[PDB]
């Protein structure tokens, strides 16, 4: 979470383990992300560290630019593609699963965003909400 990361986190569904490739929505030139780790987890015997929306994750890049590929960096989840629950009653999900990059203090690296983003993520984090064109 760290400096900048605002608020608390509600319990949302933990769809994405480590090692699920997802797309990237910013205008850095990075195409896709590959998670290697999640931050702020617990631990349970032979659990995988599970990722969700609204989470700041340690993750590498596979396709993209040569400068940013294949090195671990902080990333926010924005799109799940597995069904989660709102507290105002509805269940929902996106077409495909997606996350963006940013620094450890939560500040955005790119200058744009594609596609819709998570409401809880944009509420929890300022800067994706600053760079967000689309939410829900």
């Amino acid at each position: 979470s760290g400096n900048g990361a605002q608020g608390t986190k509600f319990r949302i569904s933990l769809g994405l383990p480590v090692g699920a490739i997802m797309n990237c929505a910013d205008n850095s030139g990075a195409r896709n992300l590959y998670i290697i780790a999640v931050k702020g987890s617990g631990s349970r015997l032979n659990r995988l560290p599970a990722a969700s929306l609204g989470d700041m994750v340690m993750a590498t890049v596979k396709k993209g630019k040569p400068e940013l590929r294949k090195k671990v960096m902080p990333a926010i989840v924005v799109r799940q593609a597995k069904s989660w629950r709102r507290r105002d009653g509805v269940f929902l999900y996106f077409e495909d699963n997606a996350g963006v990059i940013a620094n450890p203090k939560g500040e955005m690296k790119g200058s744009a965003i594609t596609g819709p983003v998570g409401k809880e993520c944009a509420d929890l984090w300022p800067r994706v909400a600053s760079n967000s064109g689309v939410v829900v």
Binding site: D88, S130, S132
Partner: protein, 244 residues
């Protein structure tokens, strides 16, 4: 009249609040100290309104309005729309609007007279904003930086943009938008001033990390003290070259 104040511990204020010459809007996070911080400056002169959007707090970037009109996207509940019309006077026009994209504060920087708009907007929205505000609406990107409403702050006094804009863009946009503007930084180099700070013609708000030059230059370009009509800029040109 520039003031440092922090939503709850974030220096990013225009994520969480909006300011017109005629009204102000605040989120509901926690305790009534942010509201009180603004009420200390404004009093009962105009409404500072607690609100929500979709049960979400992000009003300074989800919403967009001026003293003449105000918008919200689709996803607002009608209870909150009722609450808004009960909160505000009947002078200002109000509208929920249907779009592909909803991030109104992100996508519009505007003042009471004139607005800049993102280029991939839909034309019915382009029509409606000009109908409701009665303002002139302009479709451009700022140095190729997109979501111009997030990367720009604006008022009738002056203008502000993120610092990486070239001078030709600064000039052409100033001639377009009809106030002076500066490519600048806020809150320790935070390029995103549309989200980092908030302005009306007679108040300016930042977070605590903002420095003395930064508050000075924005105080100069927006001329906050009655009267500082470019006089403090003409004084503090020298600190600009000495520091940066």
């Amino acid at each position: 009249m520039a003031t440092r104040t922090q939503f709850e511990n974030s220096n990013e204020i225009g994520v969480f609040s909006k300011l017109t010459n005629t009204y102000c809007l605040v989120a509901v996070g926690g305790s009534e100290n942010f509201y009180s911080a603004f009420e200390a400056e404004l009093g009962d002169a105009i409404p500072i309104v607690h609100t929500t959007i979709a049960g979400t707090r992000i009003i300074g970037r989800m919403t967009a309005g001026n003293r003449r009109g105000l918008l919200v996207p689709t996803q607002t509940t009608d209870q909150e729309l009722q609450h808004l019309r009960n909160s505000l006077p009947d002078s200002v026009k109000i509208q929920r609007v249907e779009e592909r994209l909803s991030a109104l504060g992100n996508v519009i920087c505007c003042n009471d007279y004139v607005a800049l708009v993102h280029p991939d907007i839909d034309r019915e929205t382009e029509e409606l904003i000009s109908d409701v505000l009665g303002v002139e609406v302009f479709r451009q990107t700022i140095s190729g930086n997109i979501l111009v409403g997030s990367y720009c702050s604006l008022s009738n006094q002056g203008g502000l943009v993120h610092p990486q804009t070239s001078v030709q863009d600064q000039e052409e946009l100033s001639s377009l938008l009809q106030v002076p503007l500066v490519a600048g930084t806020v809150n320790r180099g935070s390029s995103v001033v549309g989200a980092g700070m908030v302005v009306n013609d007679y108040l300016a708000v930042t977070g605590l990390d903002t420095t003395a030059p930064e508050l000075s230059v924005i105080e100069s370009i927006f001329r906050l003290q009655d009267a500082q009509p470019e006089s403090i800029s003409g004084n503090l040109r020298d600190t600009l070259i000495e520091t940066y």
